[PDB]
Amino acid sequence: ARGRGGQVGTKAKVSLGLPVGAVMNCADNSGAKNLYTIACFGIKGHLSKLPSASIGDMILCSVKKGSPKLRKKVLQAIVIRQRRPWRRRDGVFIYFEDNAGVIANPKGEMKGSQITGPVAKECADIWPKVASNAGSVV
Amino acid sequence: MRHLLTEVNVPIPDKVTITAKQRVVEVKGPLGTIKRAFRYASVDIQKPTADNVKLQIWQASRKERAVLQSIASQIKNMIRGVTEGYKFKMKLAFAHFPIQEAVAKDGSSIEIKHFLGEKRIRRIQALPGVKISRKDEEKNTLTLQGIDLNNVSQTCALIHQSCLVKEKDIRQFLDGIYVSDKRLAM
Amino acid sequence: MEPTIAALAKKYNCEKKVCRDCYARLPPKATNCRKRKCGHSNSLRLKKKPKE
Amino acid sequence: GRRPARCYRQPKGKPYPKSRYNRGVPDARIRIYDSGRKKATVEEFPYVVHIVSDEKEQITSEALEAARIAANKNLIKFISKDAFHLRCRVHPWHVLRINKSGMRGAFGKALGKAARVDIGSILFSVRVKEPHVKYAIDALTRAKAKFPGRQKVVTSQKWGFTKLTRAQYSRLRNQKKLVTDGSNVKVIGERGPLSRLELFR
RNA sequence: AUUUUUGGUAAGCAGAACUGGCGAUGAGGGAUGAACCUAACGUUGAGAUAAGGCGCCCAAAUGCACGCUCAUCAGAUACCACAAAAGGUGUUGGUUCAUACGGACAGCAGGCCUG
RNA sequence: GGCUCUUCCUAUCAUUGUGAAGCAGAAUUCACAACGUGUCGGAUUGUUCACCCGCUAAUAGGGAACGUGAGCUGGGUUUAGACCGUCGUGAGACAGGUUAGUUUUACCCUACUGAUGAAACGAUGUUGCGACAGUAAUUUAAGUUAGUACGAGAGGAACACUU
Ligand SMILES: [Mg+2]
Ligand SMILES: [Mg+2]
Ligand SMILES: [Mg+2]
Ligand SMILES: [Mg+2]
Ligand SMILES: [Mg+2]
Numbered sequence: 089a090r091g092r093g094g095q096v097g098t099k100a101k102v103s104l105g106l107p108v109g110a111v112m113n114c115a116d117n118s119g120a121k122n123l124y125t126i127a128c129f130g131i132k133g134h135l136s137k138l139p140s141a142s143i144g145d146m147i148l149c150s151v152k153k154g155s156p157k158l159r160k161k162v163l164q165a166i167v168i169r170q171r172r173p174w175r176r177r178d179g180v181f182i183y184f185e186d187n188a189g190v191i192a193n194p195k196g197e198m199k200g201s202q203i204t205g206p207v208a209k210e211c212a213d214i215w216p217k218v219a220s221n222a223g224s225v226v
Numbered sequence: 227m228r229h230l231l232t233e234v235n236v237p238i239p240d241k242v243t244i245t246a247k248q249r250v251v252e253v254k255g256p257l258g259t260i261k262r263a264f265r266y267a268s269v270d271i272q273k274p275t276a277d278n279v280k281l282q283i284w285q286a287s288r289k290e291r292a293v294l295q296s297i298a299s300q301i302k303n304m305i306r307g308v309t310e311g312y313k314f315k316m317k318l319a320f321a322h323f324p325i326q327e328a329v330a331k332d333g334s335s336i337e338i339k340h341f342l343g344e345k346r347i348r349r350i351q352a353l354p355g356v357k358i359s360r361k362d363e364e365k366n367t368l369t370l371q372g373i374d375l376n377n378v379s380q381t382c383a384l385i386h387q388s389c390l391v392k393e394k395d396i397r398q399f400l401d402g403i404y405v406s407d408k409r410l411a412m
Numbered sequence: 413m414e415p416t417i418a419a420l421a422k423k424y425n426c427e428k429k430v431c432r433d434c435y436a437r438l439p440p441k442a443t444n445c446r447k448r449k450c451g452h453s454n455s456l457r458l459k460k461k462p463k464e
Numbered sequence: 465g466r467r468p469a470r471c472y473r474q475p476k477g478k479p480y481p482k483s484r485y486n487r488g489v490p491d492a493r494i495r496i497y498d499s500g501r502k503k504a505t506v507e508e509f510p511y512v513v514h515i516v517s518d519e520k521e522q523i524t525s526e527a528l529e530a531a532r533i534a535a536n537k538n539l540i541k542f543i544s545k546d547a548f549h550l551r552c553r554v555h556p557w558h559v560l561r562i563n564k565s566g567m568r569g570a571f572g573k574a575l576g577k578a579a580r581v582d583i584g585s586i587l588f589s590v591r592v593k594e595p596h597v598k599y600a601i602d603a604l605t606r607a608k609a610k611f612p613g614r615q616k617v618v619t620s621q622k623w624g625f626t627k628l629t630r631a632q633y634s635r636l637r638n639q640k641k642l643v644t645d646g647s648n649v650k651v652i653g654e655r656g657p658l659s660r661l662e663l664f665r
Numbered sequence: 666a667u668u669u670u671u672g673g674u675a676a677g678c679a680g681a682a683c684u685g686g687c688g689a690u691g692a693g694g695g696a697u698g699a700a701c702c703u704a705a706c707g708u709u710g711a712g713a714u715a716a717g718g719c720g721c722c723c724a725a726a727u728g729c730a731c732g733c734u735c736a737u738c739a740g741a742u743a744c745c746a747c748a749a750a751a752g753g754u755g756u757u758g759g760u761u762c763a764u765a766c767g768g769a770c771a772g773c774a775g776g777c778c779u780g
Numbered sequence: 781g782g783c784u785c786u787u788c789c790u791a792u793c794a795u796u797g798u799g800a801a802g803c804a805g806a807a808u809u810c811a812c813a814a815c816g817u818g819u820c821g822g823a824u825u826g827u828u829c830a831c832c833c834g835c836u837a838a839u840a841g842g843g844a845a846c847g848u849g850a851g852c853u854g855g856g857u858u859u860a861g862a863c864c865g866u867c868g869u870g871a872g873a874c875a876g877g878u879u880a881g882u883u884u885u886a887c888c889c890u891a892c893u894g895a896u897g898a899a900a901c902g903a904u905g906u907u908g909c910g911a912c913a914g915u916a917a918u919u920u921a922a923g924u925u926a927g928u929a930c931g932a933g934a935g936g937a938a939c940a941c942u943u
């Protein structure tokens with residue numbers, strides 16, 4: 089029982105900003121502060137090409153700082169904000185000031201209620217529960 | 227070993243006319259004219275008499291000998307073909323999804339849609355001399371008529387085959403268009 | 413559907429013979445295999461009939 | 465694992481029996497050479513089917529028991545134990561060796577026993593009644609498949625396991641010249657001391 | 666190396682016997698190449714050969730007669746560069762038992778028999 | 781041994797088209813034409829191997845002087861320093877652990893990559909032909925098909941079209 093099943097469509101092209109090992113903020117109230125990036129789904133690489141995730145992706149991660157109940161296990165998360173500038177159909181490039189993610193079950197459900205900070209557009213279309221829990225969506 | 231002489235005798239009946247030139251056989255009857263080219267065998271095709279046609283092969287080996295009777299039989303088919311034609315009936319078989327059919331006025335083409343519920347369009351163009359027909363009373367059948375056995379049997383084939391079911395147990399599914407009746411005389 | 417027809421299909425589909433060697437489906441009631449790989453081998457079986 | 469039979473197939477050696485020069489030669493997996501109804505009379509099983517090794521080779525005892533067990537199961541099931549006498553003519557006398565630092569001396573311990581067979585030596589013999597000849601011929605052929613290379617199957621016109629031709633056998637029947645022990649028949653000559661012949665009882 | 670041989674699963678392995686040979690040896694043939702086949706060498710011309718060849722590379726038969734063979738993996742030969750158990754309604758021979766106008770086989774027929 | 785790179789094998793892991801099943805569907809297994817293309821990111825270990833964490837259509841098995849040191853690297857192995865253990869009276873020894881311990885030369889020929897280029901049927905431009913050589917795209921997912929066919933139920937496809 090794994091994967092991204094609750095994704096609602098195609099995810100747009102975003103410059104991949106979070107390779108493996110990347111540690112990002114965790115914006116949910118799950119009680120985990122951060123997410124250590126282990127893999128990213130749907131990737132077959134080239135030799136020695138680091139697996140990379142971006143806004144909207146579903147990663148496989150672990151919790152480095154947070155509730156002792158959460159760390160030491162392998163969880164899935166969904167990237168919300170990234171600091172790596174990507175580009176949108178208007179030609180403008182954007183970025184947030186942090187790298188943020190929300191722990192989720194493979195079905196696309198969040199474990200948590202409030203999501204701290206804004207969530208990127210590119211995450212909403214893909215993940216309606218995440219979108220539901222957004223305070224703001226840019 | 228090598229066989230000396232082998233012959234086969236083809237009868238020619240009322241209203242049939244036959245022509246052998248350099249292995250090229252022509253047969254004209256009431257229903258039309260059919261021609262076939264035998265240039266590939268060393269056989270002797272004797273000048274036909276309105277009664278008969280004699281086929282001979284000389285200094286032959288077992289493999290060669292068979293070509294005789296087979297060319298002969300092909301002739302039998304040309305003849306019978308121009309006397310009484312050839313008609314086939316193909317039953318159109320489906321379990322759940324009804325096979326939908328559109329046949330042109332020439333009778334020269336068939337469209338098959340909705341096979342196993344597939345959204346694809348099947349196109350089959352009938353061979354020369356072959357006419358396809360479906361009536362109100364046909365009870366889900368097709369009818370292919372023509373003078374030349376080959377073109378008709380082959381058209382039936384192309385049809386049956388266009389609809390072969392794939393990537394599933396063939397013995398349970400069994401959807402398809404199959405030949406119910408072969409070698410009918412009209 | 414329509415056993416009158418099921419007959420037909422089943423005769424086109426389940427009613428053949430299979431080569432214990434090249435796997436080809438040969439005509440029922442036939443003695444030999446028509447495929448070069450086995451040299452027309454003797455041993456053949458009935459294509460396994462469906463269930464009841 | 466046991467070394468492949470193709471190693472010992474050809475008889476390259478001079479014969480190595482289990483002798484007082486051989487220590488710790490093992491046994492042979494074929495211990496019993498007779499199956500079926502052994503008690504039968506020459507009269508009861510007239511016809512013989514023989515497996516004759518066509519080749520010159522060394523057959524492993526294990527191979528023997530193989531072909532044998534096989535032929536037995538076949539015969540017993542398809543006719544009846546009562547209806548066949550199955551005899552293994554050949555015995556596995558020859559001992560194979562196997563050399564198990566380097567080559568310093570290669571003389572090996574005893575691996576197993578084999579029977580040394582020459583072209584035309586009878587391997588198996590079955591005696592049966594006419595109705596069953598085919599079945600015998602059948603199972604023997606199958607046992608031929610448990611065997612190295614070529615062997616052939618044959619029907620003898622002699623009587624059972626006897627040296628007599630069925631004709632001689634019949635004439636000697638008629639004339640009361642025959643004495644019966646099991647598979648064996650004895651013939652009576654003019655050379656015998658009269659204290660034997662039945663008449664001076 | 667031929668034949669005979671022992672140890673060894675085996676080896677272009679390790680050992681022995683008789684006669685040679687190769688080493689110490691060229692020439693023609695095995696395309697090629699120590700120990701195979703012919704054949705043993707002074708300088709040179711002719712003729713006829715051995716081994717092996719004669720469609721072209723290549724001297725010399727696309728000679729003249731027989732049988733057998735079609736490969737959607739043909740075949741093409743001593744030592745030599747490997748193939749086995751097992752299979753084929755491909756084709757041709759041969760072996761042993763059978764049928765047939767007191768009409769067979771097969772097919773279609775028809776009621777084992779019958780057209 | 782790894783790194784780098786190229787090519788070959790097929791006893792095919794995946795992808796293409798099929799045959800077979802104790803093939804309902806889904807999944808799976810056996811076989812055929814077949815390498816054309818692909819066959820990944822990290823823990824520990826000098827490692828080949830092994831074992832785990834993962835993604836993936838798949839995470840196939842091999843060859844090329846156990847491919848590849850004037851291409852690197854030098855962790856392992858195998859000099860000279862030194863520790864322990866065991867052995868030896870000893871000097872010393874381990875097919876047992878530890879720790880420190882140099883990696884030279886290309887300007888030649890070829891090879892390959894690129895670059896000029898004399899000269900025949902007169903010279904010199906411009907526009908072309910094209911022998912031959914090399915070739916390249918391979919997959920995946922989503923929508924729709926559709927909660928559909930099949931199936932008692934659980935479950936659960938495909939072709940076409942579109943991105
Ligand atoms: Mg860390
Ligand atoms: Mg790497
Ligand atoms: Mg299939
Ligand atoms: Mg299936
Ligand atoms: Mg076979």
Ligand SMILES: [Mg+2]
Pocket residue numbers: none
């Ligand atoms: Mg001799």
Ligand SMILES: [Mg+2]
Pocket residue numbers: none
């Ligand atoms: Mg020697």
Ligand SMILES: [Mg+2]
Pocket residue numbers: 668684
């Ligand atoms: Mg000698």
Ligand SMILES: [Mg+2]
Pocket residue numbers: 684685
């Ligand atoms: Mg000699």
Ligand SMILES: [Mg+2]
Pocket residue numbers: none
């Ligand atoms: Mg010397």
Ligand SMILES: [Mg+2]
Pocket residue numbers: 690
């Ligand atoms: Mg010499």
Ligand SMILES: [Mg+2]
Pocket residue numbers: none
């Ligand atoms: Mg001369």
Ligand SMILES: [Mg+2]
Pocket residue numbers: none
């Ligand atoms: Mg000629």
Ligand SMILES: [Mg+2]
Pocket residue numbers: none
């Ligand atoms: Mg293969």
Ligand SMILES: [Mg+2]
Pocket residue numbers: none
């Ligand atoms: Mg197998």
Ligand SMILES: [Mg+2]
Pocket residue numbers: none
């Ligand atoms: Mg690494």
Ligand SMILES: [Mg+2]
Pocket residue numbers: none
């Ligand atoms: Mg190396």
Ligand SMILES: [Mg+2]
Pocket residue numbers: none
């Ligand atoms: Mg040291």
Ligand SMILES: [Mg+2]
Pocket residue numbers: none
């Ligand atoms: Mg001491």
Ligand SMILES: [Mg+2]
Pocket residue numbers: none
């Ligand atoms: Mg040491």
Ligand SMILES: [Mg+2]
Pocket residue numbers: 886887
């Ligand atoms: Mg220099």
